[PDB]
Design a protein around this ligand. Structure first.
Ligand SMILES: Nc1nc2c(ncn2[C@@H]2O[C@H](COP(=O)(O)OP(=O)(O)OP(=O)(O)O)[C@@H](O)[C@H]2O)c(=O)[nH]1
Ligand SMILES: Nc1nc2c(ncn2[C@@H]2O[C@H](COP(=O)(O)OP(=O)(O)O)[C@@H](O)[C@H]2O)c(=O)[nH]1
Ligand SMILES: Nc1nc2c(ncn2[C@@H]2O[C@H](COP(=O)(O)OP(=O)(O)O)[C@@H](O)[C@H]2O)c(=O)[nH]1
Ligand SMILES: [Mg+2]
Lengths: 428, 53, 63, 408, 428
């Protein structure tokens, strides 16, 4: 009875969601038709957090799949799990955003939000007590960033006391594949600071780094980077569905890592990620989960936490483990490091223990760390936004949609001050 | 090759079941007048290699 | 006599607690084997190309 | 006619009450179905004319997923189905949510079921409230419960068993704000609050018993043993004489707890457990249940509950400081439990001056956060004004000077 | 309870320390795949000194292999016992040091030093109580000695209370397979002075004298020399792993033999080394172990203690043997000789008895000695450094890497005082 509505936009948000739902359905014993084929009773007990019961024992997800072109709605529909989605929930337009923010926010996406808000008002009335929403989108595109941050601004005026997570794929300076990347990324970080409650930052050059040096994959596709993200996406909602010795809502994680209302950009991590050659060497205990969780080779964002203080830290464990050993390793990582942790917060790490491990593992964990090393992520964008805009490199696409030049000036000082806001706790 | 490996394991399992069938039949065969009743060193103890039912 | 039977009960309880500890250690090793066997059989680490097969037909693939 | 209504608020309360009620079922003949396969159960159980025995407890939470396991567990048939009260959304480590916004949806239901339970009992001693300082519901709804019980149930005894926050380990960031904002509003509304923290019980389960890496159940069982030793003279002293003989001044109601033989069955074979041995082991600082040391303070009162068969320095004004009670039933072993079978035990409840360092550390950490105004927007936006931080801090400043003043 | 984190650096450092692990694993009954197959419990009760636990009853060593070229990190993996190591602990660069001490100290080995102090801290903070590290390296190469002193210079500062033992292979006096040897060794012995608790001195020439004259082999090899080093490495650290009638840790030898903090260069040896043919005549008693520790032909350094004085002497005995008969022989050699022992220490010998013998032997013995005849080693390195450096021979291969000429001039005068330090404990 704490339901979660999934919202997913763009090609990036529809190919993450095709793999996230492929992970949850294994976790609850749902085949690609929709019938429960499982071997427990805990799986059927709280399936209503994500699944809507149909007639005949079928379960369909509570997801809305939006896009501005019809090309990515067919590869989703032709995957292994593409026949569980309710066919009305696909909302797709017939002219793309074209890597343009303004068409996504003013011209094409503005004629589509009123045909999406009808859909999400249908899955917000099937819930006896709705917990909150979720968006997966890419900040480097045109319909993940224009329409996606247009939906959040229209959701948050209609359900203003709920929880609105995002899973942002922030652009990387090295792995980049669009010339006009920093215009959309600057004008969307301005749109996330005053309309989300939590925002996990993901860079694609940090998921390639994990798939090259830890899992040692030969050719990681996007299907192996969507599996890395989707293991954290179900690691933060895992006490809403399975019991434990010390639970954690999504609201309880909002309380403990947001000390001030504009500081909610995190960096996720997932603990037992290992190769296939190093599988018989690994010893499978709780101190090995804690050593890898805090590793700076392991964060899903491309910024190093050795360059700043840790404001607050989370940990969401799974499995059957000991509450002494869980609680003595958070104290242990906190007393050696005197100046990696902020001084006016005496205890920084919040722990929770669920009791049911992922399908095929003994135990697992998850990390949601709030750092003042996240403000270097917004300065590589702000050194490339101002290199182009000082000569007006590409503006005639953007101006000719009803958009003014002054929005490129108010979205400079509104991100130049968040860097200074994270800076004032970097040093007292 | 795989069928050979499976036959190996089934043969070992059959071997174990026949030998404990022998031991259990002897234990039932003892009575109140056997000459091998000998008040042994430590009953009610459980050896190191002991599985459950 | 009453001290004798309390001490005998304590000794017996020590034997059952030790056997329970041995049993749970062996069950932990069994779960470790299930861990590593399922993770080697998993398609993410096996990289079998059959995951690219599509429901539309055997000629098209999932991008 | 010697009943005790138990109230279990929070996940800590429910998971402790599971172990307590298993022990209470097994001490008498009660099966987990509810049938016996004598009337001494009457302090804890009610005898329906259909042969069934129903406990005198109320389980409260704002989250359903720790009471649903009680509803689907082994003890499913024992409990009355509406003695277990659940909300929909929890308090989320927020004293304001647990006091003002969410707890007001459940306070009337809890008071209704408490009134229905208290009408059965002819002679009711008092209530027992099990809670944790750090959580949301156990810090907000518990204080709201005592505030709305003081005006409703007279000068009855209101005993508290609390999980006080441990000196160096905790499972939350926002814990000191709760741990001060609940003490400020339960200072005048309580009679006796025995405080045990999880870190000292981890130390005892590592050191005395040989359980390295324990879980919460190995702690809940020892808490259940202490509660049975407190209430055992009703079944086989009272609850009423505790508040007279442990609380001199009406703001210094914070005693401590100890159980004397907590030893394993492979070391109960090696030693005597005579009355002198267990009495000496009560007063040892390695065996206390709060990580503190009464050498560095002054003793004020002691109650010694025996069950079965110049280093200690007192204050100037209390020379005697001893209450002694004796019971005859030896403690009962549960299967799967880790303590041995023994003939004698002692539980000592001691009021001491050496708990001043705990309030000094709590005030230090509250100051460390609140001087830079961290986490305040959550507490302000949920129907709670900002100035209550200032009044709670100056009130606990008065409490520290009280602990110094009585010692001088 | 008393852990040792093994480090090893270079082609010399890995071909020594891959045979040492085959020695230890058959000292404890570990098969080539890692599992335990032994017939004692003294083989298993103190195995946590060197072996991390893995899953399924499998033990992995606490060793970290650093190198600067990937060719010698595949002969190690393809040996007999090469599959026991965890594969992450293999560290290798891509471009070699090139027998250049500057290239491994300043240029190539200053970016690899940051990548190995992640490895050595994951293995140091996973011990219950760390006793102290090790090193195995050569002062003639580039990655053994350049980077290999950069490690000790760095992890003395982070861990200044622990033990830092080293097993140097200092350059040989007669045989020399590198022209640019003396710039390597002169610039490295200054870094050994300040940052090291104990240092042994092993000459590969004096290993060749043993394996021909005494052991009497037709063909010696660099496995019959790496068996002699590893049979001394095991002797110093066997009272940590096996019970005795009298114990000796790694500290209790450094407490006794190092009086003044600049004087920690020792001279190993090993007693029962006998041939096949002469075995019928040899191998008799305990007077035939004190006869052959102290024989001046058996020293593993090519410097003779008849030239000077034993500051302090040590001996670690292995085998179950008589506490009287050990103590009567050390009294016997301390009293017959007068001018081989310093005047101001009247009990120069420390003794230890370990019960469990080496593999295949019924009794054995091991030696450490400390001499003021070790300062004839540095008067021969400095005769061939300032021979070359007078006319500035190979100077461009070091100055163009970022050094300067007065880093050379201090490093000779940081050796021409330790020579004249030892010359004043020569005569009171
Ligand atoms: N001794 C003991 N302590 C417990 C147990 N369960 C929870 N705790 C304590 O509970 C504290 C965490 O707060 P909780 O009581 O779990 O949370 P809550 O009171 O339900 O508040 P909300 O989560 O907001 O609903 C921890 O500090 C633990 O010390 C238990 O079974 N035994
Ligand atoms: N991590 C991840 N990134 C993706 C995936 N699919 C696309 N992307 C990235 O998304 C960016 C393009 O975003 P896109 O969806 O095309 O935005 P749109 O044009 O507005 O739809 C590129 O940088 C891609 O690398 C995916 O499955 N996983
Ligand atoms: N004891 C021993 N010495 C060696 C071995 N290999 C090389 N050496 C000596 O070590 C010196 C060369 O150092 P090397 O390890 O090859 O250079 P590096 O690889 O850059 O560290 C020369 O003086 C060699 O004689 C070996 O296997 N054992
Ligand atoms: Mg709770």
């Amino acid at each position: 009875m704490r339901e979660i509505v999934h919202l997913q936009a763009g090609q990036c948000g529809n190919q993450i969601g095709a793999k996230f739902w492929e992970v949850i359905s294994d976790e609850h014993g749902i085949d690609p038709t929709g019938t429960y084929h499982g071997d427990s009773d805990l799986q059927l007990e709280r399936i209503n957090v994500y699944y809507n019961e149909a007639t005949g024992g079928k379960y369909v997800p509570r997801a809305v799949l939006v896009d501005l072109e019809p090309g990515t709605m067919d590869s989703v529909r032709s995957g292994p799990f593409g026949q569980i989605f309710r066919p009305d929930n696909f909302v797709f337009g017939q002219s793309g955003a074209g890597n343009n923010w303004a068409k996504g926010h003013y011209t094409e996406g503005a004629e589509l939000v009123d045909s999406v808000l009808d859909v999400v008002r249908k899955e917000a009335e099937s819930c006896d007590c709705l917990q909150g929403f979720q968006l997966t989108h890419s900040l480097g595109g045109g319909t993940g960033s224009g329409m996606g941050t247009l939906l959040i601004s229209k959701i948050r005026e209609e359900y203003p006391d709920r929880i609105m997570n995002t899973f942002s794929v922030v652009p990387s300076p090295k792995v980049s594949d669009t010339v006009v990347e920093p215009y959309n990324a600057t004008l969307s970080v301005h749109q996330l600071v005053e309309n989300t409650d939590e925002t996990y930052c993901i860079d694609n050059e940090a998921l390639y780094d994990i798939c090259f040096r830890t899992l040692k994959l030969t050719t990681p596709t996007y299907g192996d980077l969507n599996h890395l993200v989707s293991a954290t996406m179900s690691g933060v909602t895992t006490c809403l569905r399975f019991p434990g010795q010390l639970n954690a809502d999504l609201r309880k994680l909002a309380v403990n890592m947001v000390p001030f209302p504009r500081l909610h950009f995190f960096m996720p991590g997932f603990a037992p990620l290992t190769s296939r050659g190093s599988q018989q060497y690994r010893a499978l205990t709780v101190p090995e989960l804690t050593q890898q969780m805090f590793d700076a080779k392991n964060m899903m964002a491309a910024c190093d936490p050795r360059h700043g203080r840790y404001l607050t830290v989370a940990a969401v464990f799974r499995g059957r483990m000991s509450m002494k050993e869980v609680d003595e390793q958070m104290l242990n990582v906190q007393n050696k490091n005197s100046s990696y942790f902020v001084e006016w917060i005496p205890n920084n790490v919040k722990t929770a223990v669920c009791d049911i491990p992922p399908r095929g593992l003994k135990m697992s964990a998850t990390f949601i760390g709030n750092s003042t090393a996240i403000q270097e992520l917004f300065k590589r964008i702000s050194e490339q936004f101002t290199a182009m805009f000082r000569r007006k490199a590409f503006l005639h696409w953007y101006t000719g949609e009803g958009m003014d030049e002054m929005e490129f000036t108010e979205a400079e000082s509104n991100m130049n001050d968040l860097v200074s806001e994270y800076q004032q706790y970097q040093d007292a | 090759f795989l069928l050979q490996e499976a036959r190996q394991r089934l043969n070992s399992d059959h071997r174990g079941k026949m030998e404990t069938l022998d031991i259990d039949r002897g234990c039932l065969s003892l009575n109140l007048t056997s000459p091998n009743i000998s008040l042994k060193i430590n009953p009610t103890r459980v050896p190191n290699g002991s599985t459950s039912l | 006599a009453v001290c004798a039977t309390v001490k005998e009960f304590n000794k017996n309880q020590a034997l059952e607690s030790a056997e329970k500890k041995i049993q749970e250690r062996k069950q932990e090793q069994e779960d470790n084997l299930a861990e590593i066997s399922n993770m080697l059989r998993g398609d993410l680490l096996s990289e079998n190309p059959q995951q690219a097969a599509s429901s539309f037909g055997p000629h098209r693939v999932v991008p | 006619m010697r009943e005790c209504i138990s109230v279990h608020v929070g996940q800590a309360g429910v998971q402790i009450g599971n172990a307590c009620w298993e022990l209470y079922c097994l001490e008498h003949g009660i099966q987990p179905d509810g049938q016996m396969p004598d009337d001494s159960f009457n302090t804890f159980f009610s005898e329906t004319g259909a042969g069934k025995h129903v406990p005198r407890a109320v389980f409260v939470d704002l989250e359903p997923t720790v009471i649903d396991e009680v509803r689907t567990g082994t003890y499913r048939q024992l409990f009355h189905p509406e003695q277990l009260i659940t909300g929909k959304e929890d308090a989320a480590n927020n004293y304001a949510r647990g006091h003002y916004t969410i707890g007001k949806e459940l306070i009337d239901l809890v008071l209704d079921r408490i009134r229905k339970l208290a009408d059965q009992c002819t002679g009711l001693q008092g209530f027992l409230i099990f809670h944790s300082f750090g959580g949301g519901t156990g810090s907000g709804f518990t204080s709201l419960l005592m505030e709305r019980l003081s005006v409703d149930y007279g000068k009855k005894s209101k005993l508290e068993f609390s999980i006080y926050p441990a000196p160096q380990v905790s499972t939350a960031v926002v814990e000191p704000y709760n741990s001060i904002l609940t003490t400020h509003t339960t200072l005048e509304h309580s009679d006796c609050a025995f405080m045990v923290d999880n870190e000292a019980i981890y130390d005892i389960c590592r050191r005395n018993l040989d359980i390295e890496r324990p879980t919460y159940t190995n702690l809940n069982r020892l808490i259940g043993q202490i509660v049975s030793s407190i209430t055992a003279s009703l079944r086989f002293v009272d609850l009423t004489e505790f508040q007279t003989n442990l609380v001199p001044y009406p703001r210094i109601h914070f005693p401590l707890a100890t159980y004397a033989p907590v030893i394993s069955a492979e070391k109960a074979y090696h030693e005597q457990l005579s009355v002198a041995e267990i009495t000496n082991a009560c007063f040892e600082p390695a065996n206390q249940m709060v990580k503190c040391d009464p050498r560095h303070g002054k003793y004020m009162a002691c109650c010694l509950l025996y069950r079965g068969d110049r280093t200690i320095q007192f204050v100037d004004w209390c020379p005697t400081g001893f209450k002694v009670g004796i019971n005859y039933q030896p403690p009962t072993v549960v299967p799967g439990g880790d303590l041995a079978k023994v003939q004698r035990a002692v539980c000592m409840l001691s009021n001491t001056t050496a708990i001043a360092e705990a309030w000094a550390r709590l005030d230090h950490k509250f100051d460390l956060m609140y001087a830079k105004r961290a986490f305040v927007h959550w507490y302000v936006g949920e129907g709670m004004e900002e100035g209550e931080f200032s009044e709670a801090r100056e009130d606990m400043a008065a409490l520290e000077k009280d602990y110094e003043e009585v010692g001088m």
